[PDB]
PDB file of N, CA and C in Angstrom:
ATOM      1  N   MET M   1     115.665  66.958 120.577  1.00 17.40           N
ATOM      2  CA  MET M   1     116.605  67.801 120.271  1.00 17.40           C
ATOM      3  C   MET M   1     116.348  68.281 118.658  1.00 17.40           C
ATOM      4  N   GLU M   2     116.771  69.474 118.271  1.00 17.31           N
ATOM      5  CA  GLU M   2     116.567  69.902 116.919  1.00 17.31           C
ATOM      6  C   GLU M   2     115.173  69.737 116.433  1.00 17.31           C
ATOM      7  N   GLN M   3     114.979  69.503 115.259  1.00 19.00           N
ATOM      8  CA  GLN M   3     113.569  69.302 114.867  1.00 19.00           C
ATOM      9  C   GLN M   3     113.286  67.733 114.643  1.00 19.00           C
ATOM     10  N   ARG M   4     113.294  67.112 115.705  1.00 19.60           N
ATOM     11  CA  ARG M   4     113.208  65.581 115.797  1.00 19.60           C
ATOM     12  C   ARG M   4     111.623  65.225 115.756  1.00 19.60           C
ATOM     13  N   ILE M   5     111.003  65.572 114.668  1.00 18.48           N
ATOM     14  CA  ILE M   5     109.569  65.075 114.676  1.00 18.48           C
ATOM     15  C   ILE M   5     109.295  63.749 114.293  1.00 18.48           C
ATOM     16  N   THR M   6     108.188  63.143 114.486  1.00 20.86           N
ATOM     17  CA  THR M   6     108.006  61.673 114.343  1.00 20.86           C
ATOM     18  C   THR M   6     107.928  61.436 112.742  1.00 20.86           C
ATOM     19  N   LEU M   7     107.602  60.286 112.266  1.00 21.60           N
ATOM     20  CA  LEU M   7     107.396  59.991 110.839  1.00 21.60           C
ATOM     21  C   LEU M   7     105.932  60.180 110.620  1.00 21.60           C
ATOM     22  N   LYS M   8     105.037  59.971 111.598  1.00 18.40           N
ATOM     23  CA  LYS M   8     103.586  60.048 111.380  1.00 18.40           C
ATOM     24  C   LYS M   8     103.259  61.454 111.753  1.00 18.40           C
ATOM     25  N   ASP M   9     103.337  61.744 112.946  1.00 17.42           N
ATOM     26  CA  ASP M   9     102.951  63.306 113.335  1.00 17.42           C
ATOM     27  C   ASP M   9     103.498  64.314 112.297  1.00 17.42           C
ATOM     28  N   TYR M  10     104.675  64.238 111.939  1.00 21.59           N
ATOM     29  CA  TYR M  10     105.480  65.129 111.086  1.00 21.59           C
ATOM     30  C   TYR M  10     104.551  65.140 109.858  1.00 21.59           C
ATOM     31  N   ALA M  11     104.369  63.946 109.126  1.00 20.23           N
ATOM     32  CA  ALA M  11     103.654  63.877 107.933  1.00 20.23           C
ATOM     33  C   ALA M  11     102.261  64.585 108.060  1.00 20.23           C
ATOM     34  N   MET M  12     101.641  64.519 109.386  1.00 17.32           N
ATOM     35  CA  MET M  12     100.395  65.083 109.636  1.00 17.32           C
ATOM     36  C   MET M  12     100.498  66.725 109.577  1.00 17.32           C
ATOM     37  N   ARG M  13     101.522  67.205 110.064  1.00 16.64           N
ATOM     38  CA  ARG M  13     101.803  68.863 110.036  1.00 16.64           C
ATOM     39  C   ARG M  13     102.060  69.232 108.684  1.00 16.64           C
ATOM     40  N   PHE M  14     102.466  68.294 107.871  1.00 15.16           N
ATOM     41  CA  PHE M  14     103.057  68.866 106.572  1.00 15.16           C
ATOM     42  C   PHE M  14     102.052  68.099 105.431  1.00 15.16           C
ATOM     43  N   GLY M  15     102.383  66.771 105.140  1.00 14.08           N
ATOM     44  CA  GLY M  15     101.608  66.094 104.227  1.00 14.08           C
ATOM     45  C   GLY M  15     102.270  64.786 103.957  1.00 14.08           C
ATOM     46  N   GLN M  16     101.439  63.781 103.468  1.00 13.77           N
ATOM     47  CA  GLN M  16     101.900  62.472 103.171  1.00 13.77           C
ATOM     48  C   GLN M  16     102.791  62.445 101.991  1.00 13.77           C
ATOM     49  N   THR M  17     102.451  63.382 101.017  1.00 15.35           N
ATOM     50  CA  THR M  17     103.239  63.396  99.677  1.00 15.35           C
ATOM     51  C   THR M  17     104.621  64.067 100.075  1.00 15.35           C
ATOM     52  N   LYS M  18     104.534  65.012 100.928  1.00 16.04           N
ATOM     53  CA  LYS M  18     105.857  65.838 101.215  1.00 16.04           C
ATOM     54  C   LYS M  18     106.805  64.914 102.065  1.00 16.04           C
ATOM     55  N   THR M  19     106.281  64.390 103.223  1.00 17.87           N
ATOM     56  CA  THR M  19     107.159  63.462 104.074  1.00 17.87           C
ATOM     57  C   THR M  19     107.664  62.361 103.035  1.00 17.87           C
ATOM     58  N   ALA M  20     107.101  61.952 101.989  1.00 14.87           N
ATOM     59  CA  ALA M  20     107.343  60.941 101.034  1.00 14.87           C
ATOM     60  C   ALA M  20     108.467  61.339 100.278  1.00 14.87           C
ATOM     61  N   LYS M  21     108.403  62.560  99.633  1.00 15.47           N
ATOM     62  CA  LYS M  21     109.437  63.141  98.752  1.00 15.47           C
ATOM     63  C   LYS M  21     110.603  63.617  99.556  1.00 15.47           C
ATOM     64  N   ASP M  22     110.349  63.694 100.809  1.00 16.67           N
ATOM     65  CA  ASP M  22     111.347  64.107 101.655  1.00 16.67           C
ATOM     66  C   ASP M  22     112.534  62.954 101.861  1.00 16.67           C
ATOM     67  N   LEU M  23     112.054  61.846 102.117  1.00 18.89           N
ATOM     68  CA  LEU M  23     112.902  60.613 102.518  1.00 18.89           C
ATOM     69  C   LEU M  23     113.472  60.092 101.169  1.00 18.89           C
ATOM     70  N   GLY M  24     112.667  60.253 100.086  1.00 20.38           N
ATOM     71  CA  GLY M  24     113.222  59.752  98.700  1.00 20.38           C
ATOM     72  C   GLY M  24     112.611  58.248  98.515  1.00 20.38           C
ATOM     73  N   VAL M  25     111.516  58.075  99.047  1.00 18.99           N
ATOM     74  CA  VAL M  25     110.906  56.615  98.790  1.00 18.99           C
ATOM     75  C   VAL M  25     109.501  56.581  98.142  1.00 18.99           C
ATOM     76  N   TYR M  26     108.917  55.543  97.928  1.00 17.96           N
ATOM     77  CA  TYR M  26     107.555  55.418  97.312  1.00 17.96           C
ATOM     78  C   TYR M  26     106.524  55.858  98.237  1.00 17.96           C
ATOM     79  N   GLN M  27     105.521  56.421  97.625  1.00 16.71           N
ATOM     80  CA  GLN M  27     104.317  56.972  98.546  1.00 16.71           C
ATOM     81  C   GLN M  27     103.579  55.819  99.218  1.00 16.71           C
ATOM     82  N   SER M  28     103.786  54.591  98.572  1.00 17.10           N
ATOM     83  CA  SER M  28     103.077  53.426  99.251  1.00 17.10           C
ATOM     84  C   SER M  28     103.898  52.894 100.336  1.00 17.10           C
ATOM     85  N   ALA M  29     105.174  52.955 100.177  1.00 15.13           N
ATOM     86  CA  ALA M  29     105.872  52.371 101.361  1.00 15.13           C
ATOM     87  C   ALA M  29     105.800  53.238 102.490  1.00 15.13           C
ATOM     88  N   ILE M  30     105.280  54.388 102.258  1.00 15.61           N
ATOM     89  CA  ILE M  30     105.153  55.537 103.307  1.00 15.61           C
ATOM     90  C   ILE M  30     103.801  55.137 104.053  1.00 15.61           C
ATOM     91  N   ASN M  31     102.735  55.233 103.519  1.00 12.98           N
ATOM     92  CA  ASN M  31     101.349  54.877 104.148  1.00 12.98           C
ATOM     93  C   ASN M  31     101.503  53.509 104.792  1.00 12.98           C
ATOM     94  N   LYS M  32     102.432  52.874 104.444  1.00 12.22           N
ATOM     95  CA  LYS M  32     102.547  51.505 105.267  1.00 12.22           C
ATOM     96  C   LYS M  32     103.595  51.593 106.461  1.00 12.22           C
ATOM     97  N   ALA M  33     104.612  52.290 106.245  1.00 11.49           N
ATOM     98  CA  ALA M  33     105.505  52.565 107.472  1.00 11.49           C
ATOM     99  C   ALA M  33     104.836  53.474 108.434  1.00 11.49           C
ATOM    100  N   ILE M  34     103.732  54.152 107.862  1.00  8.81           N
ATOM    101  CA  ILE M  34     103.116  55.193 108.871  1.00  8.81           C
ATOM    102  C   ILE M  34     101.707  54.773 109.271  1.00  8.81           C
ATOM    103  N   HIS M  35     100.776  54.314 108.252  1.00 10.79           N
ATOM    104  CA  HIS M  35      99.485  53.793 108.497  1.00 10.79           C
ATOM    105  C   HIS M  35      99.488  52.459 109.195  1.00 10.79           C
ATOM    106  N   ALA M  36     100.672  51.786 109.253  1.00 12.03           N
ATOM    107  CA  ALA M  36     100.651  50.736 109.945  1.00 12.03           C
ATOM    108  C   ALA M  36     100.852  50.691 111.543  1.00 12.03           C
ATOM    109  N   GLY M  37     101.994  50.860 112.008  1.00  9.64           N
ATOM    110  CA  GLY M  37     102.020  51.180 113.472  1.00  9.64           C
ATOM    111  C   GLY M  37     103.414  51.083 113.853  1.00  9.64           C
ATOM    112  N   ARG M  38     104.326  51.829 113.202  1.00  6.31           N
ATOM    113  CA  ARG M  38     105.844  51.868 113.713  1.00  6.31           C
ATOM    114  C   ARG M  38     106.067  53.040 114.557  1.00  6.31           C
ATOM    115  N   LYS M  39     107.443  53.363 114.771  1.00  9.17           N
ATOM    116  CA  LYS M  39     107.679  54.442 115.690  1.00  9.17           C
ATOM    117  C   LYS M  39     109.037  54.945 115.306  1.00  9.17           C
ATOM    118  N   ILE M  40     108.899  55.918 114.396  1.00  8.35           N
ATOM    119  CA  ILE M  40     110.277  56.638 113.927  1.00  8.35           C
ATOM    120  C   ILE M  40     110.188  58.078 114.286  1.00  8.35           C
ATOM    121  N   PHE M  41     111.307  58.747 114.029  1.00  5.75           N
ATOM    122  CA  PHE M  41     111.436  60.210 114.190  1.00  5.75           C
ATOM    123  C   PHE M  41     112.451  60.881 113.426  1.00  5.75           C
ATOM    124  N   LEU M  42     112.257  61.736 112.562  1.00  4.58           N
ATOM    125  CA  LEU M  42     113.076  62.334 111.461  1.00  4.58           C
ATOM    126  C   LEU M  42     113.641  63.625 112.165  1.00  4.58           C
ATOM    127  N   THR M  43     115.026  63.747 112.266  1.00  6.00           N
ATOM    128  CA  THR M  43     115.586  64.844 112.862  1.00  6.00           C
ATOM    129  C   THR M  43     115.860  65.948 111.637  1.00  6.00           C
ATOM    130  N   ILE M  44     115.096  66.932 111.477  1.00  2.14           N
ATOM    131  CA  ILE M  44     115.318  67.787 110.399  1.00  2.14           C
ATOM    132  C   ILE M  44     116.359  68.896 110.822  1.00  2.14           C
ATOM    133  N   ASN M  45     117.334  69.387 109.909  1.00  2.00           N
ATOM    134  CA  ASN M  45     118.128  70.474 110.075  1.00  2.00           C
ATOM    135  C   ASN M  45     117.428  71.756 110.559  1.00  2.00           C
ATOM    136  N   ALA M  46     116.275  71.755 110.130  1.00  2.00           N
ATOM    137  CA  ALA M  46     115.372  72.995 110.212  1.00  2.00           C
ATOM    138  C   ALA M  46     115.551  73.871 109.016  1.00  2.00           C
ATOM    139  N   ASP M  47     116.615  73.495 108.367  1.00  2.00           N
ATOM    140  CA  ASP M  47     116.793  74.055 106.955  1.00  2.00           C
ATOM    141  C   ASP M  47     116.101  73.479 105.890  1.00  2.00           C
ATOM    142  N   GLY M  48     115.462  72.297 106.149  1.00  2.00           N
ATOM    143  CA  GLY M  48     114.601  71.568 105.164  1.00  2.00           C
ATOM    144  C   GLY M  48     115.311  70.123 105.081  1.00  2.00           C
ATOM    145  N   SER M  49     116.325  69.943 105.749  1.00  2.00           N
ATOM    146  CA  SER M  49     117.024  68.592 105.572  1.00  2.00           C
ATOM    147  C   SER M  49     116.175  67.439 106.188  1.00  2.00           C
ATOM    148  N   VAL M  50     116.676  66.211 106.154  1.00  2.00           N
ATOM    149  CA  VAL M  50     115.963  65.223 107.021  1.00  2.00           C
ATOM    150  C   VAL M  50     116.904  64.099 107.426  1.00  2.00           C
ATOM    151  N   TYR M  51     116.627  63.741 108.632  1.00  2.00           N
ATOM    152  CA  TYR M  51     117.586  62.643 109.139  1.00  2.00           C
ATOM    153  C   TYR M  51     116.699  61.429 109.729  1.00  2.00           C
ATOM    154  N   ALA M  52     116.047  60.693 108.873  1.00  2.00           N
ATOM    155  CA  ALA M  52     115.124  59.574 109.362  1.00  2.00           C
ATOM    156  C   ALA M  52     115.761  58.759 110.586  1.00  2.00           C
ATOM    157  N   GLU M  53     115.193  58.710 111.759  1.00  2.00           N
ATOM    158  CA  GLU M  53     115.604  57.903 112.750  1.00  2.00           C
ATOM    159  C   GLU M  53     114.681  56.870 113.314  1.00  2.00           C
ATOM    160  N   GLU M  54     114.587  55.542 112.583  1.00  2.00           N
ATOM    161  CA  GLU M  54     113.655  54.704 113.017  1.00  2.00           C
ATOM    162  C   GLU M  54     114.126  53.893 114.312  1.00  2.00           C
ATOM    163  N   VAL M  55     113.299  53.571 115.151  1.00  2.00           N
ATOM    164  CA  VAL M  55     113.754  52.748 116.484  1.00  2.00           C
ATOM    165  C   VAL M  55     112.847  51.713 116.726  1.00  2.00           C
ATOM    166  N   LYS M  56     112.925  50.422 116.115  1.00  2.00           N
ATOM    167  CA  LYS M  56     112.183  49.302 116.389  1.00  2.00           C
ATOM    168  C   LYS M  56     112.799  48.364 117.380  1.00  2.00           C
ATOM    169  N   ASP M  57     112.385  48.626 118.660  1.00  2.00           N
ATOM    170  CA  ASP M  57     112.723  47.964 119.827  1.00  2.00           C
ATOM    171  C   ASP M  57     113.813  46.590 119.484  1.00  2.00           C
ATOM    172  N   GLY M  58     114.904  47.014 119.072  1.00  2.00           N
ATOM    173  CA  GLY M  58     115.910  45.880 118.584  1.00  2.00           C
ATOM    174  C   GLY M  58     116.944  46.399 117.730  1.00  2.00           C
ATOM    175  N   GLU M  59     116.673  47.495 116.899  1.00  2.00           N
ATOM    176  CA  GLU M  59     117.632  48.165 116.087  1.00  2.00           C
ATOM    177  C   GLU M  59     117.112  49.412 115.474  1.00  2.00           C
ATOM    178  N   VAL M  60     117.884  50.569 115.568  1.00  3.70           N
ATOM    179  CA  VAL M  60     117.433  51.841 114.943  1.00  3.70           C
ATOM    180  C   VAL M  60     118.223  52.025 113.612  1.00  3.70           C
ATOM    181  N   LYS M  61     117.348  52.209 112.615  1.00  3.59           N
ATOM    182  CA  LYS M  61     117.968  52.466 111.137  1.00  3.59           C
ATOM    183  C   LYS M  61     117.413  53.758 110.470  1.00  3.59           C
ATOM    184  N   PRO M  62     118.351  54.135 109.714  1.00  2.00           N
ATOM    185  CA  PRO M  62     117.725  55.428 108.816  1.00  2.00           C
ATOM    186  C   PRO M  62     116.593  55.228 107.795  1.00  2.00           C
ATOM    187  N   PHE M  63     116.834  54.295 106.963  1.00  2.00           N
ATOM    188  CA  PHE M  63     115.760  53.917 105.949  1.00  2.00           C
ATOM    189  C   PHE M  63     115.253  55.208 105.277  1.00  2.00           C
ATOM    190  N   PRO M  64     115.531  55.292 104.015  1.00  2.00           N
ATOM    191  CA  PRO M  64     116.324  54.161 103.304  1.00  2.00           C
ATOM    192  C   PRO M  64     117.654  54.052 103.839  1.00  2.00           C
ATOM    193  N   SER M  65     118.183  52.829 104.135  1.00  2.00           N
ATOM    194  CA  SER M  65     119.528  52.505 104.729  1.00  2.00           C
ATOM    195  C   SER M  65     120.525  52.316 103.599  1.00  2.00           C
ATOM    196  N   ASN M  66     121.794  52.172 103.975  1.00  2.00           N
ATOM    197  CA  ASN M  66     122.794  51.877 102.884  1.00  2.00           C
ATOM    198  C   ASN M  66     123.523  50.783 103.288  1.00  2.00           C
ATOM    199  N   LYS M  67     124.261  50.095 102.362  1.00  2.00           N
ATOM    200  CA  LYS M  67     125.156  48.615 102.775  1.00  2.00           C
ATOM    201  C   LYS M  67     125.906  48.286 101.548  1.00  2.00           C
ATOM    202  N   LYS M  68     126.762  49.096 100.925  1.00  2.00           N
ATOM    203  CA  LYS M  68     127.512  48.625  99.894  1.00  2.00           C
ATOM    204  C   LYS M  68     128.657  47.599 100.269  1.00  2.00           C
ATOM    205  N   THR M  69     128.079  46.362 100.316  1.00  2.00           N
ATOM    206  CA  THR M  69     129.216  45.300 100.957  1.00  2.00           C
ATOM    207  C   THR M  69     129.013  44.046 100.255  1.00  2.00           C
ATOM    208  N   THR M  70     127.815  43.301 100.832  1.00  2.00           N
ATOM    209  CA  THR M  70     127.635  41.987 100.233  1.00  2.00           C
ATOM    210  C   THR M  70     126.765  42.124  99.055  1.00  2.00           C
ATOM    211  N   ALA M  71     126.420  43.415  98.611  1.00  2.00           N
ATOM    212  CA  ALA M  71     125.606  43.567  97.384  1.00  2.00           C
ATOM    213  C   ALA M  71     126.459  44.236  96.271  1.00  2.00           C
TER     214      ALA M  71
END
């Protein structure tokens, strides 16, 4: 649905530095979450937005995720 491209494939169609500056994380944490062997899918509004949707058989998270409670 929508532009739900993967985290890896997506980067291949655009670039590793673009998918990195898109989520707002370091370029290293990218090549590791992608060159490693994960399985995520970002849903882009198509207007250029980004909705990271990771799904690691056990819990799906946005990442970067939020949690202003015990911190």
